[PDB]
Design a protein around this ligand. Sequence first.
Ligand SMILES: [Zn+2]
Length: 30
Amino acid sequence: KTYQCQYCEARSADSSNLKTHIKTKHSKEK
Ligand SMILES: [Zn+2]
């Protein structure tokens, strides 16, 4: 149904959104 981060266990319904999340909460990818 949703997409969950490919680093942690976060869940989003869009892509741009999840990427944003990574940029600041992981700051390693992509
Ligand atoms: Zn994450």
